[PDB]
Ligand binder design. Sequence first.
Ligand SMILES: Nc1ccn([C@@H]2O[C@H](COP(=O)(O)OP(=O)(O)O)[C@@H](O)[C@H]2O)c(=O)n1
Ligand SMILES: Nc1ccn([C@@H]2O[C@H](COP(=O)(O)OP(=O)(O)O)[C@@H](O)[C@H]2O)c(=O)n1
Ligand SMILES: Nc1ccn([C@@H]2O[C@H](COP(=O)(O)OP(=O)(O)O)[C@@H](O)[C@H]2O)c(=O)n1
Ligand SMILES: [Cl-]
Ligand SMILES: [Cl-]
Ligand SMILES: [Cl-]
Ligand SMILES: [Cl-]
Ligand SMILES: [Cl-]
Ligand SMILES: [Cl-]
Ligand SMILES: [Cl-]
Ligand SMILES: [Cl-]
Ligand SMILES: [Cl-]
Ligand SMILES: [Zn+2]
Ligand SMILES: [Zn+2]
Ligand SMILES: [Zn+2]
Ligand SMILES: [Zn+2]
Ligand SMILES: [Zn+2]
Ligand SMILES: [Zn+2]
Lengths: 156, 156, 156
Amino acid sequence: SYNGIRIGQGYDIHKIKVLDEEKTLTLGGVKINNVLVLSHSDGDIIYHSIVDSILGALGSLDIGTLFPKNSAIFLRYARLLIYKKNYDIGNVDINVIAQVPKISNIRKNIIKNISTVLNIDESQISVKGKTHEKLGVIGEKKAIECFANILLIPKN
Amino acid sequence: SYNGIRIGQGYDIHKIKVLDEEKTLTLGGVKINNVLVLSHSDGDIIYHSIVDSILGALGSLDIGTLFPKNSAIFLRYARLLIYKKNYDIGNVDINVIAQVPKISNIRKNIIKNISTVLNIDESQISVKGKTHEKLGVIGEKKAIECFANILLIPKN
Amino acid sequence: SYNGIRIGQGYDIHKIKVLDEEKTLTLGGVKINNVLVLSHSDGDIIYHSIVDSILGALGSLDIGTLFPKNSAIFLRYARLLIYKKNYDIGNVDINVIAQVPKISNIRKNIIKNISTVLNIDESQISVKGKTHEKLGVIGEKKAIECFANILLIPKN
Ligand SMILES: Nc1ccn([C@@H]2O[C@H](COP(=O)(O)OP(=O)(O)O)[C@@H](O)[C@H]2O)c(=O)n1
Ligand SMILES: Nc1ccn([C@@H]2O[C@H](COP(=O)(O)OP(=O)(O)O)[C@@H](O)[C@H]2O)c(=O)n1
Ligand SMILES: Nc1ccn([C@@H]2O[C@H](COP(=O)(O)OP(=O)(O)O)[C@@H](O)[C@H]2O)c(=O)n1
Ligand SMILES: [Cl-]
Ligand SMILES: [Cl-]
Ligand SMILES: [Cl-]
Ligand SMILES: [Cl-]
Ligand SMILES: [Cl-]
Ligand SMILES: [Cl-]
Ligand SMILES: [Cl-]
Ligand SMILES: [Cl-]
Ligand SMILES: [Cl-]
Ligand SMILES: [Zn+2]
Ligand SMILES: [Zn+2]
Ligand SMILES: [Zn+2]
Ligand SMILES: [Zn+2]
Ligand SMILES: [Zn+2]
Ligand SMILES: [Zn+2]
């Protein structure tokens, strides 16, 4: 099998409801108290997209296929999968597309959370947010989405 | 010129019509009998995005520019282009965004088809599907889209 | 800190108005005389996404966070950031999603501009355009978007 450098991209989207004037969202392990997420899961697009980026990189079946609370269970599986396949994470770059919340205000916390759950250094993690210019389903605050991009580097 | 590791990302989108109650789509070389694709081409977002990921990685002009049935012709061009530029494929990770069909039900076939047409091992290929939460043009089954991410590794 | 190969992905979107029958857009440093961009910035999704791909790859704060004309200022920052962190650019692959303008007609100019501002060879750059099948906000010419994908390679 292929044991060289591997690229992965994870994608996720969840429906949200912003608590304006007319379950609580979790994002990179950080509770977002002014936004509700309409999902059976915790709605954490960052954690979910990171997991699928890792699975994708290794050619494993995705979380939905493998397993038809949970975000922590999936992140620990992914961490241990990387280890048992003799890989290290190089870096991860995460793009959140969302009107709200403001990722730059919670970046440090998200990066700390990701570093802890994956057992990597904060210097290996990037998380950035961009609005959708108030256009389309994301722009009208009906949903938020995440693209997670990762490199896995073979050990020795 | 640059002869080091290369990253590529391919994107494609095609209009579809799901055969519900009020040309046949091909996806990763697999016929999808309950979905029509409204395109001049075969509508195979997976094969097309894979080709453009390879061209993109190598800095070549895209399929639309190079060549203004066909999917097989383009995939063989891409395979031979990688070879003549002294590269091997590392791995490819493919993200389909679509309400239907269910990629996990046809994953094995798609992966087998990609491995055959690119002459690589199945362990170098990932294909995953995600819905769009029934929101927007993808969510309303008006279209399907694909992001293909690839690494090309120099030979010796 | 991590000093190995790094992946980055930049995303950007800007609102546009096509000058049909019932500020001027800049794209990869090329003026697009038949399209207006509705932004406080120059609206250059290519340059902006390239910058954020570089920042993302290195784990730096994004342009919006770092700096709350300008596109040239940000591209020179990114170039010098790569240098001071002891990295070289491997290659960059850029995907523009837009009905208009036609990227293939201005590809050579964009690639020349990117090579000049980043001080890299044209063989390290790919830029490709795809329509959105006249569907959604992009398809209805309300916006254009860019995904920039990059590898940074450590020096020696
Ligand atoms: N076109 C599709 C859609 C979903 N699926 C599978 O269904 C699972 C869940 O789909 P979903 O879009 O509802 O995602 P979640 O709501 O679980 O986050 C995915 O992880 C895939 O395994 C697929 O294989 N192909
Ligand atoms: N903004 C755009 C749109 C299309 N194009 C070119 O037109 C070709 C076909 O465009 P399209 O969006 O109709 O894609 P297909 O329907 O051929 O899959 C692309 O491959 C590009 O070469 C471009 O260069 N810039
Ligand atoms: N969900 C979001 C949205 C914006 N932002 C920040 O706000 C800056 C500008 O956001 P924007 O979507 O208006 O992008 P521009 O119009 O500046 O191109 C971004 O670069 C981020 O630093 C964020 O951190 N999280
Ligand atoms: Cl949801
Ligand atoms: Cl988008
Ligand atoms: Cl969207
Ligand atoms: Cl189509
Ligand atoms: Cl999307
Ligand atoms: Cl879309
Ligand atoms: Cl804008
Ligand atoms: Cl899109
Ligand atoms: Cl969009
Ligand atoms: Zn999710
Ligand atoms: Zn968009
Ligand atoms: Zn196509
Ligand atoms: Zn979306
Ligand atoms: Zn911008
Ligand atoms: Zn789309």
